[PDB]
Nucleic acid binder design. Sequence first.
RNA 1: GAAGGCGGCUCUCUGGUCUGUAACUGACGCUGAGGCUCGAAAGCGUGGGGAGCAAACAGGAUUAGAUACCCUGGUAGUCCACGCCGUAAACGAUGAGUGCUAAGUGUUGGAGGGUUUCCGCCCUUCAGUGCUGCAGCAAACGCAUUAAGCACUCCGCCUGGGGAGUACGACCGCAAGGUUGAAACUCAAAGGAAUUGACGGGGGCCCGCACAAGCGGUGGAGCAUGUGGUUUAAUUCGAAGCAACG
Lengths: 116, 153
Amino acid sequence: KNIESGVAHIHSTFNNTIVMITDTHGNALAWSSAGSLGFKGSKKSTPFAAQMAAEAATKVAMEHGLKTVDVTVKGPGSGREAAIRSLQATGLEVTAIRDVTPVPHNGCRPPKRRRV
Amino acid sequence: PRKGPVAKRDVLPDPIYNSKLVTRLINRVMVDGKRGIAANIIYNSFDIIKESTGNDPLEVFEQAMKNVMPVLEVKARRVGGSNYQVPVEVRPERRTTLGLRWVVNYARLRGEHTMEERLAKEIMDAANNTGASVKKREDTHKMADANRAFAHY
RNA sequence: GAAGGCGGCUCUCUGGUCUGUAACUGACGCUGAGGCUCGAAAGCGUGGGGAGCAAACAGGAUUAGAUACCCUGGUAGUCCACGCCGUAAACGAUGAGUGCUAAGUGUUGGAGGGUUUCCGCCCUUCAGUGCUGCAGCAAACGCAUUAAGCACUCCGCCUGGGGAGUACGACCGCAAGGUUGAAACUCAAAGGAAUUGACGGGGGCCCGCACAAGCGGUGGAGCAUGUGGUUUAAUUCGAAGCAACG
Ligand SMILES: [K+]
Ligand SMILES: [K+]
Ligand SMILES: [K+]
Ligand SMILES: [K+]
Ligand SMILES: [K+]
Ligand SMILES: [K+]
Ligand SMILES: [Mg+2]
Ligand SMILES: [Mg+2]
Ligand SMILES: [Mg+2]
Ligand SMILES: [Mg+2]
Ligand SMILES: [Mg+2]
Ligand SMILES: [Mg+2]
């Protein structure tokens, strides 16, 4: 109901960026996305859309009550820095930043190349 | 052109209002080089403005310019197979040009009988922050905001 | 590692290679038709397994059409054991063995020495792997102690293009197909390398009211005029995208 510390996960792919503020235990608190803010097609992948989504999720989390968060970035999306700066500007204190992009140690076979 | 930026020719201030802006307005409203007709129209419209309101017509006109001159325009950019609009800050010269062009076009589109009457009405509406020119500026800003996601371009 | 190919770590079994020494045998060697063995991927049989991917297939897009490219799913297969299949641009598109013919410089595994307190640094040398480059070779491209140079031994293979790796026969295979393999007929070319242009939905750099920014137009109307078509006794002839049509 009221929190002080949290984790902001930014899953930013080439098509869309989702921002999810959870408690330190991984229980979701608030979330937003470029698609959730009405952006469509290319705009969903733009850095600006990441900024707006991060702002909205930050506002919801802060209304829930939240001062500091640590950021976990995932995916190769371009909007990661935009979302981070959006969080900081909106107020959440970004204590630490980490990249959690999955890196298979070979493992599973990826799909075929496009246009072949 | 390809070579680079071109020299811009300056204009002289108006004989009575001492306003290069007024001279530019006369030039914009001029047709087929009938500058006498254009200047008479502009001065008659300014007199109409001074009669209809207690404010200096020059100040009313500058109020209209302040209310009509855009700040962010949309320029079409073709990237690969995708062509989309991109917001762009309007340099002051193009701002003034757009203001004058919009004012003159919507004055000509107005419904009153005489051009000076139409122009005075449009100028006063723009000063009051209403009318076709103000709507045009608002729509330009709306388009820029809609395409604002492409600012990095 | 002969090749195909082999990439987490551990242990068991196991092959080969290389460097020294010079104790041993004393030419015992090379090649090798026919044979035998291995032989990517796909494929086949039996029985398992099955996450991701993905022929086929389904749907959605695109398009004139789209039995494709693109997107969403998705069966065989991809994995394992055993057994078939024996084909690949199975390529260094370069059989194996041996000897000789400038150097320069990387790197891999050793050996020896001269320093170096050791490390390390220098020289030499052996066997691989690369790049550069003499002589020589080559049609040229280029190769050049890892020859495509100079030589000898053996094996395989070639004799214009198509027909055709097809037909018949034969052998192999569960099958798919593999191996061997013509002829009739037909053409005066096919082909390799390189050169000059032209072109490219290749690249790079430039210019032009070429585009972009504006102004004004045409296309709509009446008429003038030229052209086409049609008509006519004739509607004289020429001009036909830009670059014919006041
Ligand atoms: K061994
Ligand atoms: K099988
Ligand atoms: K060497
Ligand atoms: K022949
Ligand atoms: K015309
Ligand atoms: K014509
Ligand atoms: Mg297989
Ligand atoms: Mg697919
Ligand atoms: Mg063969
Ligand atoms: Mg060597
Ligand atoms: Mg233009
Ligand atoms: Mg017309």
